[PDB]
Amino acid sequence: MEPQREFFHIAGRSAKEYLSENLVQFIQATQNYFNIGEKFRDPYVAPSAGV
Amino acid sequence: RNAVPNQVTERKFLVDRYLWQIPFSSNFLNMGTLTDLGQNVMYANSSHSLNMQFTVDPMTEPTYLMLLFGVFDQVVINQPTRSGISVAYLRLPFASGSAA
Amino acid sequence: DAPVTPYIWQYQPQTGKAAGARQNYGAVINWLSADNNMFHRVQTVNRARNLIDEIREETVRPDLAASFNDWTYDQLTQPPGTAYLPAPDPLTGPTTIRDKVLSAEGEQLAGSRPSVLHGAPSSKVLSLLSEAPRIPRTEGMTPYQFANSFPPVVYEDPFSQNLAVFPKEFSPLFEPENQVLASSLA
Numbered sequence: 001m002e003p004q005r006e007f008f009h010i011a012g013r014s015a016k017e018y019l020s021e022n023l024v025q026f027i028q029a030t031q032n033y034f035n036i037g038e039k040f041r042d043p044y045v046a047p048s049a050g051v
Numbered sequence: 052r053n054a055v056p057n058q059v060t061e062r063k064f065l066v067d068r069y070l071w072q073i074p075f076s077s078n079f080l081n082m083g084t085l086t087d088l089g090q091n092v093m094y095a096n097s098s099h100s101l102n103m104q105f106t107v108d109p110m111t112e113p114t115y116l117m118l119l120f121g122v123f124d125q126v127v128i129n130q131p132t133r134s135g136i137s138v139a140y141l142r143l144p145f146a147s148g149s150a151a
Numbered sequence: 152d153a154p155v156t157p158y159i160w161q162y163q164p165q166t167g168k169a170a171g172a173r174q175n176y177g178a179v180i181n182w183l184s185a186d187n188n189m190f191h192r193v194q195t196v197n198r199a200r201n202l203i204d205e206i207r208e209e210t211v212r213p214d215l216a217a218s219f220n221d222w223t224y225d226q227l228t229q230p231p232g233t234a235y236l237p238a239p240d241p242l243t244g245p246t247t248i249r250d251k252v253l254s255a256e257g258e259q260l261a262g263s264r265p266s267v268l269h270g271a272p273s274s275k276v277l278s279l280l281s282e283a284p285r286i287p288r289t290e291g292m293t294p295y296q297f298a299n300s301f302p303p304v305v306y307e308d309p310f311s312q313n314l315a316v317f318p319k320e321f322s323p324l325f326e327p328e329n330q331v332l333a334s335s336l337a
Contacts, residue, residue: 098160145177150182
């Protein structure tokens with residue numbers, strides 16, 4: 001359940017974390033002309049505790 | 052001036068292009084793509100049946116029912132070497148269970 | 152070199168029993184077009200979810216599995232409530248005797264003071280509202296208890312033991328009327 005959803009980013013860490021640190025600094029520099037950062041899925045989860 | 056009395060009012064509506072949706076949420080809001088009842092442990096770690104039924108208007112011809120279930124189509128795709136490419140698909144909850 | 156998929160349980164909402172156990176299809180990674188490098192990554196997170204489930208199935212409290220689908224009252228979570236305090240004498244009520252005395256003096260009375268709810272002298276009276284029933288509940292588990300106990304079991308080798316430890320409870324057509332008796336068997 002938990003490790004299955006983190007390998008495919010059903011849930012888990014956002015795109016700023018599970019990528020390499022050098023790969024994040026690349027796709028921020030070349031974002032204005034050669035967009036890469038839309039090729040990596042970003043999770044977005046509900047709280048489900050106290051809402 | 053001389054309108055007919057005893058007249059009765061009829062209502063209807065028309066939605067085009069819409070595809071009626073029921074969100075699988077506790078309060079029917081969008082608090083996330085992964086909903087709040089989706090990460091409930093009561094559903095994910097216990098198999099449940101499903102018995103739903105609709106009562107549409109009758110029509111003079113056969114008709115389908117284009118029902119959709121919200122799943123998470125996901126891929127990963129590595130390219131580890133030269134001329135090498137491979138994927139690992141899943142979709143949950145409705146995975147094509149053939150691998151065991 | 153592939154681990155097995157864990158058997159997930161089926162909860163029957165009426166009677167609270169478990170209606171067998173099928174394997175967890177619908178949560179299976181489609182590895183059928185992966186090379187030798189992605190296959191090792193996929194079968195690692197399959198060995199990770201089995202390692203989580205083997206930790207969770209260590210605490211299955213092994214006398215619920217002995218009386219499987221045959222649970223009695225002391226093995227079930229009961230709704231909370233106090234013990235039995237006897238009901239007080241209605242002659243000792245605050246306005247019962249004085250209504251028989253003040254009226255017989257000649258008065259006609261109408262009117263009364265609101266109660267404690269606004270609609271052991273006094274702890275005996277207010278214990279009526281939070282009282283447990285006489286006989287507790289038998290033969291049924293709430294889904295709070297069916298999820299706390301009975302995790303998704305893992306069945307590492309499929310059906311390669313003696314027939315006495317054959318997992319007969321995984322069939323949905325399992326009644327507790329048969330020869331061999333249940334125990335902690337994964």
